[PDB]
Design a protein around this ligand. Structure first.
Ligand SMILES: *[C@@H]1O[C@H](CO)[C@@H](O[C@@H]2O[C@H](CO)[C@@H](O[C@@H]3O[C@H](CO)[C@@H](O)[C@H](O)[C@@H]3O)[C@H](O)[C@H]2NC(C)=O)[C@H](O)[C@H]1NC(C)=O
Ligand SMILES: *[C@@H]1O[C@H](CO)[C@@H](O[C@@H]2O[C@H](CO)[C@@H](O[C@H]3O[C@H](CO)[C@@H](O)[C@H](O)[C@@H]3O)[C@H](O)[C@H]2NC(C)=O)[C@H](O)[C@H]1NC(C)=O
Ligand SMILES: *[C@@H]1O[C@H](CO)[C@@H](O)[C@H](O)[C@H]1NC(C)=O
Ligand SMILES: *[C@@H]1O[C@H](CO)[C@@H](O)[C@H](O)[C@H]1NC(C)=O
Ligand SMILES: *[C@@H]1O[C@H](CO)[C@@H](O)[C@H](O)[C@H]1NC(C)=O
Length: 814
């Protein structure tokens, strides 16, 4: 016979050898390698191995006795008995789980493919049959938004805590904490120091509530967090073959019920490693993608053999995407600063700057000096210096002391360093950029009894996944930055029903009080028809008010969730508002721009009308602002918008509809209300607008207390004034343009948190087309606005709460 089957390593008579010497003599049987050697180095059966005489040094068996001795290769039944593999079976729905005793609550496995950009599945899906089937049979989104910076430790730790890096403390793999005077490195023993890891990873949450955990690698799983390790964890060793990681998890799923985990993790270094080395569009990445596709297949086949393929909930995920770097698209700061030796620059697309003399000069150092030094130096400059607190609030990258006070925002494909010596190869693949860039977006597929089948969900953020995993494991989540219930649409049977938050103190009233018509110091433009009988013009019939309320608060009035705060509803013909006596300012106005409404070019500067519903105050007078070089004022509900006349809406000039405003910000505000709002109103057939001030002096993304606000007032012309840190805008139309904002089945929303700064250095003015770009950069989720104002919107919409949460957590795209 001319085959080695049955005779591996036996000396033979029959002119065809099966011993190691044959190779040198070139007289091996044609199947010698496949039959006798390959089995020492592979985890697969194949037509050469089916019914093999058992070899002692094989990793797994394809011998006839393999099912009895329980060590068949995972693909044994597919290849050697002609059964179908998991990927070959058509989708079938999992309406009831089929689990062994112990899994009354089914297990969840969090499977991470490092650096798997969402685009890889968009484009190479036809080369990835297993992940493609998981998508087809499961719950998929085209894009999961990672956290900023779009790096590995921060995103993995974010996924298992539901926290932004600014709150969980792992902002990068290399950090300096000044209050600890220590440095974090993965090569150091500081990696194991629990001082670094804030929040509560899901394996900790689980342990407190009775469930055990098995992590085969994950950031934090090798650290004693709140005094807890996972019940099973592995010391990181990237050289462990992917197959052995998957086989280990399959061994864990066969432990007896008393010691068998409910929560599992699996981490693979591909395709991040190949992406860095060869670029995201490369033969090496295609091969890496096909390899990880096969490892997912190996898991699914393994689960089928254990009859757990209709039991386990699989979350297939990645931390971040991958971009093509270029030596032509790297910025070196030494060009503008020279070979200075006193600063450390964290290089890459998420570049940060710090003094070398730490912790001594960390707070005293002249950040603003370098910030101004590096601003608007070139035309079409590809980087932008920001003091952390001036970065867009959507990035939630400021609160932590481990975030260097000076950061850089870089354009897509662009990185930054001090000089070419202090960086790795410029032409490599890279990640770290803004978390809304296409190529940074991440993988998400959910498959199992808990998840819906054949569903394509809209973009959601990875900070939402912790709550989802808690629901899948019947866990009460630790407090986190996800909006519990926003991902209920992914689940067959949601376990948490969200409720709209309750107003703590009921709305105070601001009654009309007869008082003297005073001089406010105004040189009003003649065209404006004043309010000559206030009490006449503002004594409204219930019918008249119902009409006004229906037109201006179609979604309900914003509700205040702040504890010690007293607001009152002020009514007008074209807008409503919530006024704060404590801060002498409205917290919010609400109005509606209709398609065919008039915007006036008529000047309305130095013109205010007194509101008799509140006490007159110095800071409500035109005179307080007349030739004032510290602060000016602006209107929330815009006087340029008339429904009745073609002139100026006089009621909009009330003292109660003004906010402190820097003259530089007036350009942005004036351009928005004169030009943009008109274009938006036409494009969307009407726009409901809610605008207001924001006080975030703590730069923690949260509305500050009344108590803390008292101490942040500035003294200008011997008066106490509170100057907003930001202004928020929330635009609301219908998805269907045919209908107007008052009659929408489905809301289309767009929100901004615009920074309130004394100059427009951020936009490098040198055509106001830059105002559009600044609005886009400072876009926010309605949830972001809610958190930073203490307000809660759309509480009167007839939609279920979970659907409203989905809408509020949405970030807009352009
Ligand atoms: C993201 O979610 C986390 C947790 O839900 C939020 O972080 C937490 O922020 C609160 C308020 O700043 C912190 O509480 C406080 O502790 C200090 C120090 O003892 C105390 O003086 C205060 O009175 C208050 O009780 C809490 O420590 C903190 N937790 C963590 C893990 O950082 C964060 O606010 C959320 N971020 C956003 C933007 O919603
Ligand atoms: C990290 O994981 C590595 C890959 O899984 C692993 O490397 C391997 O270690 C085995 C034994 O632990 C080596 O095998 C040699 O030792 C056996 C045992 O007696 C001897 O019979 C043989 O001489 C055999 O050569 C493998 O050579 C080695 N595999 C690879 C690919 O390197 C390490 O143990 C793990 N730990 C660290 C931190 O590196
Ligand atoms: C801080 O660490 C530095 C070295 O990193 C050390 O020389 C110094 O003694 C430490 N303590 C302080 C508070 O400066
Ligand atoms: C910025 O400061 C550096 C020193 O770090 C200096 O070389 C350069 O002249 C300054 N650039 C200016 C004033 O824009
Ligand atoms: C005050 O008036 C002076 C004189 O024209 C002018 O230079 C200055 O800009 C004015 N300041 C403000 C902010 O109105």
């Amino acid at each position: 016979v001319k085959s080695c089957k049955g005779r591996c390593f036996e000396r033979t008579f029959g002119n065809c050898r099966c011993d190691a010497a044959c190779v040198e003599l070139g007289n091996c049987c044609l199947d010698y390698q496949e039959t006798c050697i390959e089995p020492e180095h592979i985890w697969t059966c194949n037509k050469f191995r089916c019914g093999e005489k058992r070899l002692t040094r094989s990793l797994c068996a394809c011998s006839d006795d393999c099912k009895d001795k329980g060590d068949c290769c995972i693909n044994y039944s597919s290849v050697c008995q002609g059964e179908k593999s998991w990927v070959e079976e058509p989708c079938e729905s999992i309406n009831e789980p089929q689990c062994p005793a112990g899994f009354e609550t089914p297990p969840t496995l969090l499977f991470s493919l490092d650096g798997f950009r969402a685009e890889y599945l968009h484009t190479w899906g036809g080369l990835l049959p297993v992940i493609s089937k998981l998508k087809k049979c499961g719950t998929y989104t085209k894009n999961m938004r990672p956290v900023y910076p779009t790096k590995t430790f921060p995103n993995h730790y974010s996924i298992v805590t539901g926290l932004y890096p600014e709150s969980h403390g792992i902002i990068d793999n290399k950090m300096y904490d000044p209050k600890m005077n220590a440095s974090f490195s993965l090569k150091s023993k500081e990696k194991f120091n629990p001082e670094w890891y804030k929040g509560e990873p899901i394996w900790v949450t689980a342990k407190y509530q009775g469930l055990k955990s098995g992590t085969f690698f994950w950031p934090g799983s090798d650290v004693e967090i709140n005094g807890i390790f996972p019940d099973i964890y592995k010391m990181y060793n990237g050289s462990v073959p992917f197959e052995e990681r998957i086989l280990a998890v399959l061994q864990w799923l066969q432990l007896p019920k008393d010691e068998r985990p409910h929560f599992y993790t699996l981490y693979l270094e591909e395709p991040d490693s190949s992406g860095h080395s060869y670029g995201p569009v490369s033969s090496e990445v295609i091969k890496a993608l096909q390899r990880v596709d096969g490892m997912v297949g190996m898991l699914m086949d393994g689960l089928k053999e254990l009859n757990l393929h209709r039991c386990l909930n699989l979350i297939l995920i990645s931390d971040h995407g991958m971009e093509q770097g270029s030596c032509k698209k790297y910025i070196y700061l030494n060009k503008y600063l020279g070979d200075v030796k006193n600063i450390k620059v964290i290089y890459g697309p998420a570049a940060r700057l710090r003094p070398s003399d730490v912790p001594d000069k960390y707070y005293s150092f002249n950040y603003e000096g370098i910030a101004r030094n590096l601003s608007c130096r070139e035309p079409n400059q590809h980087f932008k210096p920001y003091l952390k607190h001036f970065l867009p609030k959507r990035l939630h990258f400021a609160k932590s002391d481990r975030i260097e006070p000076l950061t850089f925002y870089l354009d897509p494909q662009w990185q930054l360093a001090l000089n070419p010596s202090e960086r790795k190869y410029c032409g490599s693949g890279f990640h770290g950029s803004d978390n809304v860039f296409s190529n940074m977006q991440a993988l998400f597929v959910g498959y199992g009894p808990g998840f819906k089948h054949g569903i394509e969900a809209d973009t959601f953020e990875n900070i939402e996944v912790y709550n989802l995993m808690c629901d899948l494991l019947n866990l009460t989540p630790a407090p986190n930055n996800g909006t519990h219930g926003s991902l209920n649409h992914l689940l067959k049977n949601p376990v948490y029903t969200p409720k709209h938050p309750k107003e703590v103190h009921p709305l105070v009233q601001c009654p009309f009080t007869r008082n003297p018509r005073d001089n406010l110091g105004c040189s009003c433009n003649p065209s404006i028809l004043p309010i000559e009988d206030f009490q006449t013009q503002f004594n409204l019939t219930v019918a008249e008010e119902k009409i006004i309320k229906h037109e201006t608060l179609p979604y309900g009035r914003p509700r205040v969730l702040q504890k010690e705060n007293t607001i009152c509803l002020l009514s007008q013909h074209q807008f409503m508002s919530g006024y704060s006596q404590d801060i002498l300012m409205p917290l919010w106005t609400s109005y509606t721009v209709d398609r065919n409404d008039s915007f006036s070019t008529e000047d309305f500067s130095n013109c205010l009308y007194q509101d008799f519903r509140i006490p007159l105050s110095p800071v409500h007078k035109c005179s307080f602002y007349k030739n004032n070089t510290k602060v000016s004022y602006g209107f929330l509900s815009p006087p340029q918008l008339n429904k009745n006349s073609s002139g100026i809406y006089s009621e909009a000039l009330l003292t109660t509809n003004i906010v402190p405003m820097y003259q530089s910000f007036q350009v942005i505000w004036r351009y928005f209300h004169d030009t943009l709002l008109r274009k938006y109103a036409e494009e969307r057939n009407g726009v409901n607008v809610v605008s207001g001030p924001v006080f975030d002096f703590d730069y923690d993304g949260r509305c500050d207390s009344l108590e803390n606000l008292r101490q942040k007032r500035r003294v200008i012309r011997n008066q106490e004034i509170l100057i907003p840190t930001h202004f928020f805008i929330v635009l609301t139309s219908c998805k269907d343009t045919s209908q107007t904002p008052l009659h929408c089945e489905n809301l289309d929303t767009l929100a901004f948190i615009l920074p309130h700064r004394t100059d427009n250095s951020e936009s490098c003015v040198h055509d106001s087309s830059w105002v559009e770009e600044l609005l886009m950069l400072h876009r926010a989720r309605i949830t972001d606005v809610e958190h930073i104002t203490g307000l809660s919107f759309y509480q009167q919409r007839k939609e279920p709460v979970s659907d409203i949460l989905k809408l509020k957590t949405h970030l807009p795209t352009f």
